[PDB]
Design a protein around this ligand. Structure first.
Ligand SMILES: Cc1cn([C@H]2C[C@H](O)[C@@H](COP(=O)(O)OP(=O)(O)OP(=O)(O)O)O2)c(=O)[nH]c1=O
Ligand SMILES: [Mg+2]
Length: 726
DNA sequence: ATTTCGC
RNA sequence: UGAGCGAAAUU
């Protein structure tokens, strides 16, 4: 990277590239071979410039533990070659699976936006957004080399990609990859299958894959369902954790227990996905033409060569499995797995347990497909046979050994057959789920989730006891090491906590900070902002309060994509959380008992609203669809008129003397609304209290939950407001 | 620019 | 060593 920061080398390489490009633009060869020669010449010139600058300045197949340098290379290579060799060929049988189920097609506009030619403005947003300080690819070039040689590379890379779209082939250098072996987290190193194969490609191939990945990500929301939250932008991990906790609670509270929960785990899902099946399901999804023409070309003859201890092992074909490290690979994998997800959802034999008017079948991630069943005796068998069919078609293999399960039955003898038939390893206490121990009983969540947290704190604080750093250094270590772990647990499980937990956590943190000494400066002063002179000592109580109150944003937005908020158990009238934020205070309705996660949010919302001394029941941000105006009889058709004409707030429709008449568009829309509704709305807005409640400047707190339509920094803003208030 | 987590 | 996607926090 130091060589690239030389101005003379910079100018020399610029001149060399210009010369090289304006020397042999003939017609005998193509742009791909020219680009390969370009890369080779640049490598040679870089080697020469570096020289000038320096002048100026495991167990084998039999199980035996072998240490022979040649034998280990021969066995790991054989294992990986056998892993990447089996390629399916029953293309006729593949389409039979697809034709039996429904898939979401794309309209003409979407494919048209998918097949638009690559322009010069679609590469500037990719090269600049390329992460730096990474490892070089097989060629040896770095991302910053493209980043800082941007002024001339773009309008010839444009022609190179033009050639790729027009003809349909890629340079032979775009297929090379490097595989490095890495030890997994918490596994024995003696087994050959315990390593993590990571792959690195060329930077230009990464740029092309990023362009395609963004082009398909613009519609990935329409493509796959909202159950899957892995790699989908705008979705968070706890979306499924909270849902699973709600299902656990519902099963626990049910008097008739005949349910089961299975945490299915795939066995090397990335490396076991058949390329022909992914191509055919991409074709079936309505994607055809230029996009398919290039995607098929990028997976024609992918090769990879392993590197161990700096050895250039010979390459072998990748006949199967999407090459990991590809920005486009997660999208294709999600598309392929969406077929299985929709097959499970559409199947009537698989019966999910109904949560009131909402029915939940299964939850998804990258691989952690957890599925909730009813009457396991036949539902588990149907799921297993469907997964077997999908396995034969596509190669998706499940590691039944690692897959755990929860059995919820009342009869002792009925459980015996269930354990005997299904090969699942039924767990009794805990199942790991994205770092959250899903307790079999809800009442043990605090015991098995936060006490081990505190134990790990008391261990890791013992680990960093002999670091000769400043107290600001220890504060920073706290901030970037211990805070995210607690915030993740709060986000996943924001339940009521006794004050002893916070007291002892604060005690441990303060012992960490002062290094077995007493406080030197006031805690309150250091807890203030940097402008006040403090170093902003974290306040875990405020973070907990912010995390608990964060659910009000999703309450107000009323997004249909999320289903976790509707899974709460309610033996009472239907959904209430929609008409709670900035709505009429409804009486004679007491939540709790059944609730585990939302009632505490409402209590904490009311407490902070009262501390703000502002009215939370009639605000300028009140929705038209609020209960404030449908308590009096109205017609549904009236609301959607001003919803699509003016907006959703109660301020824009009109209050006081501006009832549905404040702008020429509203003046022309006034007669559209029905008169019987108009006489009601008028009278409603004639009241002095309504006018003074609506016509005011909203505070920052209201703007946090109302005007913002993005979650990028909700906890930060809410915690800042809480810190200002408290 | 950096950190952590999930995969 | 050490790559990719997504999420969160500090500046
Ligand atoms: C953890 C991890 C996963 N991945 C990708 C590759 C994996 O196929 C995918 C999910 O991996 P996992 O399902 O977490 O691991 P695995 O299924 O291979 O475990 P096992 O060896 O027992 O079969 O995410 C990375 O690219 N980098 C990573 O660091
Ligand atoms: Mg797996």
């Amino acid at each position: 990277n130091l060589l690239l920061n030389d101005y003379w080398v910079h100018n020399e390489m610029k001149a060399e590239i210009k010369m090289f490009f304006e020397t042999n633009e003939n017609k005998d060869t193509t742009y791909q071979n020219l680009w390969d020669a370009f890369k080779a010449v640049c490598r040679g010139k870089f080697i020469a410039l570096n020289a000038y600058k320096r002048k100026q300045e495991i167990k084998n197949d039999k199980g035996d533990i072998t240490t022979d340098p040649t034998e280990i290379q021969t066995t790991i290579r054989e294992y990986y070659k056998h892993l990447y060799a089996n390629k399916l060929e029953n293309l006729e049988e593949m389409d039979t699976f697809l034709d039996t189920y429904t898939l979401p097609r794309l309209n003409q506009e979407e494919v048209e936006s998918l097949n638009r030619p690559i322009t010069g403005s679609e590469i500037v947003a990719i090269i600049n957004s390329l992460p730096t300080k990474k490892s070089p690819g097989p060629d040896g070039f770095t991302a910053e080399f493209y980043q800082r040689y941007k002024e001339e590379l773009v309008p010839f890379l444009l022609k190179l990609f033009q050639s790729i779209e027009k003809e349909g082939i890629l340079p032979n250098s775009f297929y090379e990859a490097s595989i490095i072996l890495i030890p997994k987290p918490g596994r024995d190193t003696t087994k050959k299958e315990n390593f993590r194969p990571i792959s690195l490609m060329n930077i230009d191939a990464k740029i092309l894959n990023k362009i395609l990945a963004n082009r398909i990500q613009q519609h990935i929301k329409k493509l796959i369902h909202h159950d899957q939250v892995g790699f989908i932008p705008g979705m968070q991990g706890w979306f499924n954790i909270r849902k699973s906790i709600n299902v656990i609670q519902h099963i626990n509270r049910a008097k008739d227990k005949n349910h089961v929960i299975i945490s299915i785990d795939a066995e090397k899902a990335f490396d076991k996905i058949q390329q022909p099946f992914m191509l055919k399901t991409l074709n079936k999804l309505g994607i055809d033409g230029m996009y398919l023409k290039i995607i098929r070309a990028i997976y024609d003859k992918p090769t990879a060569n392993i590197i161990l201890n700096g050895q250039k092992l010979e390459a072998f074909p990748l006949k199967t499995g999407t090459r990991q490290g590809c920005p486009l690979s997660p999208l294709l994998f999600n598309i392929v797995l969406e077929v299985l997800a929709r097959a499970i959802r559409q199947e009537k034999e698989i019966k999910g347990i109904q949560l009131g008017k909402e029915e939940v079948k299964l939850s998804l991630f990258a691989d952690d497909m957890i599925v909730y069943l009813e009457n396991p005796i036949v539902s588990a068998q149907n799921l297993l046979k469907l997964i077997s069919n999908f396995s034969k078609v596509s190669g998706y293999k499940i590691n039944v050994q690692k897959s755990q399960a929860f059995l919820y039955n009342n009869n002792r003898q009925t459980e015996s057959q269930i354990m005997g038939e299904l090969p699942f390893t039924i767990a009794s206490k805990r199942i790991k789920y994205l770092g959250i121990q899903l307790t079999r009983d809800v009442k043990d969540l605090f015991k098995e989730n936060y006490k081990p947290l505190l134990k790990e704190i008391k261990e890791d604080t013992n680990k960093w006891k002999n670091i000769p750093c400043s107290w600001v250094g220890r504060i920073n270590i706290v901030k970037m090491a211990i805070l995210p772990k607690v915030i993740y647990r709060f986000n996943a499980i924001p339940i009521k906590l006794p004050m002893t937990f916070f007291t002892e956590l604060e005690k441990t943190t303060l012992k960490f900070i002062w290094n077995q000494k007493r406080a030197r400066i006031a805690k309150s002063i250091l807890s203030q902002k940097n402008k006040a002179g403090g170093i902003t000592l974290p306040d875990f109580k405020l973070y907990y309060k912010a995390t608990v109150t964060k659910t009000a944003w999703y309450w107000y937005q009323n997004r249909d994509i999320d289903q976790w908020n509707r899974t709460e158990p309610s033996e009472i009238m239907p959904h209430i959380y929609n008409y709670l934020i900035f709505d009429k205070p409804e009486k004679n309705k007491q939540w709790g008992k059944d609730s585990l996660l939302n009632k505490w949010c409402w209590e904490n919302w009311l407490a902070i609203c009262r501390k703000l001394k502002l009215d939370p029941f009639l605000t300028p941000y009140t929705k038209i669809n609020s209960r404030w105006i449908k308590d009096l009889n109205v017609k549904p058709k009236t609301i959607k008129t001003l919803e699509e004409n003016l907006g959703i707030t109660i301020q824009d429709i009109g209050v006081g003397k501006d009832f549905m008449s404040k702008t020429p568009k509203a003046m022309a829309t006034k007669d559209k609304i029905d008169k019987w509704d108009l006489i009601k709305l008028k009278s409603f807005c004639t009241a002095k209290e309504t006018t003074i409640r609506v016509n005011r400047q909203p505070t920052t707190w209201e703007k946090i939950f109302a005007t913002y339509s993005s979650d990028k920094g909700l906890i930060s803003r809410i915690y800042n407001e809480l810190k200002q208030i408290y």
